[PDB]
Amino acid sequence: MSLFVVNAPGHEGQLKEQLIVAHKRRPLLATAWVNPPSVLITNSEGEVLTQVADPPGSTGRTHQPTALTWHPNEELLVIGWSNGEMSLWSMPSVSSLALGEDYTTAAARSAVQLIAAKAATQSSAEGATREHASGAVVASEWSTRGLYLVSASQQRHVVMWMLEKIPAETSVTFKLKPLWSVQSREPVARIIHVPSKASDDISFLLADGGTSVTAINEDQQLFPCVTQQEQIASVLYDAATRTLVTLTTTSMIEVYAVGEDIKGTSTLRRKLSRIAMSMVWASPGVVAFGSGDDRLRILDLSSGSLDVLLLPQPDLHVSSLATFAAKGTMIVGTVEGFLVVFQHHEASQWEAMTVHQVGKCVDRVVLTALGDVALCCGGSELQVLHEIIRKRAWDGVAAATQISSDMVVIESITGCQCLLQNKGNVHGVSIAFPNIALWNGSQIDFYMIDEATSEITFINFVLTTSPAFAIHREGLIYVKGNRIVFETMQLAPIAQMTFTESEGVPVIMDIMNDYLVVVSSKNYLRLARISTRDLQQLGPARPLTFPLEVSVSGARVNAQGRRVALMSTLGPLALPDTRIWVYDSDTDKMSFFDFGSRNEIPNSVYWNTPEPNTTTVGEFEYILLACETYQENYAEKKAELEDARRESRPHNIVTFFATHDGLVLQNFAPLRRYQICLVGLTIPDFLLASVKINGDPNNAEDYVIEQKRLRDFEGLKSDKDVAVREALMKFSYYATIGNMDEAYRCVKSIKNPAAWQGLARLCVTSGRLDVAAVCLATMEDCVAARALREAKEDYPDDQDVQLATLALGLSMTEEAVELLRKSKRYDLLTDVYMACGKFEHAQRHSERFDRARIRPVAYKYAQFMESLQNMDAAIMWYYNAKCASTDVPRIFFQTNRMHELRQLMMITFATIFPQNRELLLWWAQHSERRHNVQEALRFYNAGEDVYNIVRILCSLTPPKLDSALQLVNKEMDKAKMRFQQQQAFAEPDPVGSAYFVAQLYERQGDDQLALQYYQAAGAYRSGVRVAWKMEQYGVVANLAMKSSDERLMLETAMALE
């Protein structure tokens, strides 16, 4: 998280939209004002250096500065006025003094820059009004090497100016001499330069806002380069690839390739689907533009594909654009007053880094050399915004968090809260309760905190420019020169220590409890112990090795003064780095961890901060490190809806265990949008600064010091016991290092079941089971214990299913379903999906992966509706489970809805039920129960159940033998059809119903017919008993052996005798 400190140096005049100029490399900035017309020259951070009034020789008339331009290398400014004159503002160079290299601090360099700019000179170029024909100088442009100047007036004239850098006795002066006098069609809106070689030649382009883009070279002729059918709006040029882009007022863009003679050939032509359109270079070969709408548009010249970069907030309209190619940041300014900063990791590769709300109509956005954002807003308002990190501090009693340019919220865990507004800005904050101190560059102001009356009593200031300072209970430590001085709150000098220039100047100073860490500008680190009288240094300076240029930006020290966490930045532009550095001074070892693998960039890193008069803190609590980084279930959500309403780039609070064997990743925790920042670590409680309920982040009062328990400290809300807490710390440490046996040993002495559920979760994540049985048995959770025991009994060869069962018992659902996806067990996964009240997921999983447990899903839904007593869906879901022969009749009979079933079966329910075969057979059986024989026969015929029809027909009085014989012979013909098909592919299938017919003949003496129909039916046992009748015994053979029934053959062998 970052915030833009705002400097708004007012001027008596009115600001101009496009008249802000920023030097590319030197931290300089200048802008024009009118009535009274002047120019304000300021540094990158926004402090005013100088102001320059009307050009020399003016006869009482103030002249409006109409054009400004910076020299690409020299700290030289050129100003074209409105009366035809031209002036050059030049300050004496700092390096001409040939002083020492003691300018290692920004404040000293700013001071020498200011004292150099005080004696600056504004020189007049002779005869400028003659060359511009008494016309206002509309535009100006230096060459790439800064040797040639081009000026354009309002009288349609273009003049070439030669720069002569002559040496003098004390400095180097500059003379501008006119060379040409070139006529233009219209006053030139923009002058661009083309270099001969990609990285002294004459190659310029002039755009006058009309239908002409006139090139010019050393030939002194204004030959056009490219002319289009419409009036041009703007031109955007890439010097490295010599790529020109012409944009018209009608949302038309053309891409040209500039040759040696400044001639363009069209290769990419495109159309875009009051604020004038703006267009800037987002990346080499990638152009970003906006048409005053809510969307950005990004064009890739290499591929020709145009994408739209969306803004989630409606009503926003882009007003101006700028880009910083060094870090890849676009600064979108809006009419409302919203500044959006985009940082690179074609539209999918960009992201919104941050959002800022200045709150005024942004006329123009400019970017200085160091990355500061100058803003012309409100017509006559200049605001320089400098990105600084959120300066937050915590001592052990209260937290002081910076939330704006100057507002600081100081709040304690006891309920005390107060607001601090510094007279100047805020750059550093140090708290050692009740002492508070703020550093704003030039001076450090230290006050007290009156907790009883919520007052802040100002003690005093020290006029020091040290970037490193720290206030303590006994006094304040601040750097002054090459030395550091530790004093009291009443400016009583207690001690001081001095360092040589070869040892550098301290840049980082961090104190906590009674330990101090000092880091210089050349990676020199010193650790010391503060006392009541002296500062006992522990060892000499130690160099550190980092396996462009690495500069350490921050240093934190644990409460032992033994291990140091280090934040470093890359390059002179201070690009944040994705590495955390841990240094063990006692063992003199250097370890690091990379945040690039997690796609995260850190902001701050914090050690554990023990409370005052609390000496029961072990070294495992001291080695813990915390850092902030940034990249069907209807009665379920309402339980956490209170938290969801308490909610009214992602945050990652990540904690490591700093080990002498290396850095081990302990735990990770996402945050929410109302938890703005982490102010420090107070074991076992995170100290996230948060906004209150239904609050606003920009409000100063709307801030509370929120305290959330660690993810490894579940179930410990008393925060009183010490032995349990330290044993849990050791358990977490041994779980992270993988020493699960020592974790078991540590939790064995803990009577809190929270340690046991932590160990059970560790067993889930480590594949341990017999220890997990003890974990479940210690928490008095017999449900999970018996579930694990049955899982072991049912699956003795699979530990994955047992682990999934344990995780499900431990309220770990997502881990369990992922494990069961890994473990192939889709049926158990479907059962779990049903058991969590998600029948839609069960249906999808059944229809996608395992298409064999969809009937259980339907049946379980039917039972769910039956218990819910929504029978309208219960009946249709019992039908969908293909169990309409046992359950839908049951659900009709039990609810006494028999009349509706009778009406349904008499022939949404009537569309499906009457034609179902199983329902018809059930109703036939039910009517046969009611002795309604004829209705049963009718329904059996409608359901095509030959066995039951033959049984009833043969059981009737008189027996309807003819139709029974017809059906029996039809089934015999079907069986013979099957056997003939089998033989053509190369004793048919017996027909059971024929058995009944034989029984009739068995009661009528028709022995031969009874035997024939028994044999056709497959009644070998009855075949024997009917073969015994007259005399035949061979027919007894070939029957028993067909059944492979040993008893039959045995008995026949006995009976043959």
Partner 1 sequence: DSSEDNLYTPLPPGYTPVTLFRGTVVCQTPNGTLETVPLQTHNNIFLRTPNAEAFYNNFSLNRLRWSSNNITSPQEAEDLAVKSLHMLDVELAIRVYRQLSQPSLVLCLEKIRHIHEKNLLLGHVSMIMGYMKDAQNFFLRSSQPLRALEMRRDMMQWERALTLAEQLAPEEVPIISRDYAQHLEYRGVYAKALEMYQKGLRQLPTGHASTELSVTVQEVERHNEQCRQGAARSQIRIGNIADAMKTVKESSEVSFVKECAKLCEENQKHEEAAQLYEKAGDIERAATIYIERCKNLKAAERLLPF
Partner 2 sequence: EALEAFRAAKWPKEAMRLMETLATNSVTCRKFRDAAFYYIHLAEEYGRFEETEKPTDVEKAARIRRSKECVRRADIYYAFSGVYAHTTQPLPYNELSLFRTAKYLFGMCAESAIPINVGKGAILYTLSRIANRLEMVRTARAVFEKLQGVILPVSMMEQVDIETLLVRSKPVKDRDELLDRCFRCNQLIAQLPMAGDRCPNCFHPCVRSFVNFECLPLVEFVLADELTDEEAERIIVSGNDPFFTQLQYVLRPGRPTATYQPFVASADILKGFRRDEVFIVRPRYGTLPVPNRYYRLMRSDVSVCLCNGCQHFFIAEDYEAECMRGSGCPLCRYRPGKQVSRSMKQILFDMETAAAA
Q: Distances in Å between the alpha carbon of 347 and those of 74, 245, 307, 309?
A: 37, 20, 6, 6
- Alpha-carbon span 69 to 589, nearest angstrom: 52
Chosen residue from 61, 345, 848, 929 binding partner 2 by CB under 8 A: 929
Residue 660 binding target from partner 2, partner 1, none, CB below 5 to 8 Å by type: none
Residues between 1022 and 1041 that touch partner 2 (CB under 8 A): 1022
Residue 503 or 935 with smaller CB distance to partner 2: 935
849 contacts which partner out of partner 2, partner 1, none, CB within 5 to 8 A by kind? Answer: none
793 binds, among partner 2, partner 1, none (CB under 5 to 8 A by kind): none
776 binds, among partner 2, partner 1, none (CB under 5 to 8 A by kind): partner 1
CB of 554 to partner 2, least distance (A): 59
* Position 887 contacts partner 2 (CB under 8 A): yes
**Is the CB of 43 or the CB of 993 nearer to partner 2?**
993
Torsion over CA: 175, 179, 181, 182 (sign): negative
Residue 910 — φ and ψ, nearest 5°? -70, -20
CA angle 334, 335, 338 (to 5 degrees): 45
Check: CB of residue 353 under 8 Å from CB of residue 397: no
Question: How many whole angstroms separate alpha carbon 961 and alpha carbon 1020?
Answer: 23
Helix (H) or strand (E) run with residue 669 in it: strand 662-670
In angstroms, the CA 119 to CA 90 distance is 9
Rule CB under 8 A: say whether 890 interacts with partner 2.
Answer: yes
Q: Which is nearer to partner 1, 777 or 912 (CB)?
A: 777
Query: From partner 1, partner 2, none, which one binds at residue 926 (CB under 5 to 8 Å depending on kind)?
Result: partner 2
Whole-angstrom Cα distance, residue 943 to residue 129?
112
Q: Which does 265 bind (CB under 5 to 8 A by kind): partner 2, partner 1, none?
A: none
- In this complex, which beta carbon is closest to partner 2, that of residue 523 or of residue 993? 993
Amino acid symbol at 864? F
Residue 886 lies near partner 2 (rule: CB under 8 A) = yes
Query: What residues from 970 to 989 belong to the interface with partner 2 (CB under 8 A)?
Result: 978, 981-982, 985, 987
881 binds partner 2 (CB under 8 A): yes
Asked if 118 and 50 count as a contact pair (C-beta separation under 8 A), the reply is yes
Strands 535-537, 524-530: pairing kind: antiparallel
Distance CA 908, CA 875 (A): 11
For residue 414, give both structure tokens: 């006891």
CA distance linking residue 1023 with residue 470, whole number of Å: 111
Select from 353-361, 593-601, 643-651, 993-1001 the region that touches partner 2 (CB under 8 A). Answer: 993-1001
Token pair for 427: 């750059």
Of the candidate residues 424, 856, 914, 959, the single one contacting partner 2 (CB under 8 A):
856
> H/E/C letters for each residue in 844-895?
HHHHHCCCCCHHHHHHHHHHHHHHHCCHHHHHHHHHHCCCCCCCHHHHHHHC
Q: Measure the CA–CA gap between 643 and 477, rounded to whole angstroms.
A: 44
Per partner kind, with CB cut-offs from 5 to 8 A, the member of partner 1, partner 2, none near residue 271 is none
Going by C-beta distance under 8 Å and a sequence separation of 6 or more, which residues neighbour residue 872? none
Residue 142: contacted member of partner 1, partner 2, none (CB under 5 to 8 Å, by partner type): none
Question: Residues 107-113: contacts with CB within 8 Å, 24+ apart?
Answer: 107/441, 107/442, 107/465, 107/467, 108/465, 110/43, 110/45, 110/47, 113/43, 113/49
Which of 393, 397, 926, 1015 lies at the binding interface for partner 2 (CB under 8 A)? 926
**Beta bridge mates, 518:** 509, 526
Residue among 855 and 1047 whose Cβ is closer to partner 1: 855
Binding mask 940-969 for partner 2 (x = CB under 8 A): -------x----------------------
Q: Which does 987 bind (CB under 5 to 8 A by kind): partner 1, partner 2, none?
A: partner 2
Complex with partner 2: residue 519 or 950, whichever CB lies closer: 950
Binding residues among 764-803 for partner 2 as defined by CB under 8 A? 796
Interface pattern 611-640 for partner 2 (x via CB under 8 A): ------------------------------
* Cα angle: 923, vertex 929, 932; to 5 degrees: 80
- DSSP for 786-848 reads HHHHHHHHH-TT-HHHHHHHHHHHTT-HHHHHHHHHHT--HHHHHHHHHHTT-HHHHHHHHHH
Judged by CB under 8 A, which of 178, 728, 1020, 1039 binds partner 2? 1020
Out of 693, 722, 852, 907, the only residue in the binding site for partner 2 (CB under 8 A) is 852
Dihedrals phi, psi of 335, to nearest 5 degrees: -70, -35
The option from partner 1, partner 2, none interacting with 613 (CB < 5 to 8 A, set by class) reads none
Q: Is 292 left (phi over 0), alpha (psi -120 to 50) or beta?
A: left
Q: Considering the complex, what minimum distance in angstroms separates the CB of residue 871 from partner 1? A: 12
Give which of partner 2, partner 1, none residue 773 binds (C-beta under 5 to 8 Å, depending on kind).
partner 1
1043 binds, among partner 2, partner 1, none (CB under 5 to 8 A by kind): partner 2
Binding mask 896-925 for partner 2 (x = CB under 8 A): -----------------------------x
Q: Give the binding-site size for partner 2 (rule: CB under 8 A).
A: 45
Residues that bind partner 1 (CB under 8 A): 633-636, 638-639, 748, 773-774, 776-777, 780, 782-787, 789-790, 805, 808-809, 811, 813, 831-832, 834-837, 863-864, 867-870
If the CB atoms of residues 855 and 976 are measured against partner 1, the closer one turns out to be 855
787 binds, among partner 2, partner 1, none (CB under 5 to 8 A by kind): partner 1
Q: 835 or 898: whose CB is closer to partner 1? A: 835
Instruction: Name the amino acid, one letter, at 861.
Output: Y
Report, in Å, the least distance between residue 867 CB and partner 1: 4
Choose among partner 1, partner 2, none what residue 77 binds, the Cβ cut-off being 5 to 8 Å by kind.
none
Residue 748, contacted partner among partner 2, partner 1, none, CB below 5-8 A by kind:
partner 1
Pairing of strands 444-447, 524-530: unpaired
Q: Which does 452 bind (CB under 5 to 8 A by kind): partner 2, partner 1, none?
A: none
| Euclidean distance between CA atoms 7 and 21, whole angstroms | 17
For residues 634 and 985, which CB has a smaller minimum distance to partner 2 in the complex? 985
To partner 1, the closest distance from the beta carbon of 809 in angstroms equals 4
Regarding 25 and contact with partner 2 (CB under 8 A), the answer is no
Indicate the residue among 206 and 784 with the shorter CB distance to partner 1: 784
Q: How far apart are CA 710 and CA 733, in angstroms?
A: 14
Partner in contact with 883, chosen from partner 1, partner 2, none, beta carbon below 5 to 8 Å by kind:
partner 2
Helix-helix angle 1007-1017:961-985, to 10 degrees: 50
The separation between CA 686 and the C-alpha centre of its own chain, rounded to angstroms, equals 21
Minimum distance, C-beta of residue 833 to partner 1, in the bound complex (Å): 9
- Cβ neighbourhood burial of 48 (10 Å; 0-12, 13-18, 19+): middle
Q: What is the spatial distance between Cα 789 and Cα 794, in angstroms, rounded to a whole number? A: 9
Q: Is residue 611 a contact partner of residue 396, using CB atoms and an 8 Å limit?
A: yes
Q: Return the DSSP state at 639.
A: G
Select the span of 107-115, 202-210, 775-783, 854-862 touching partner 2 (CB under 8 A). 854-862
- Asked if residue 993 binds partner 2 (CB under 8 A), the reply is yes
Interface with partner 2 (CB under 8 A)? 796, 827, 852-853, 855-856, 859-860, 881, 883, 886-887, 889-890, 893-894, 925-926, 928-929, 947, 978, 981-982, 985, 987, 992-993, 995-996, 1017-1022, 1042-1045, 1047-1048, 1050-1051, 1054
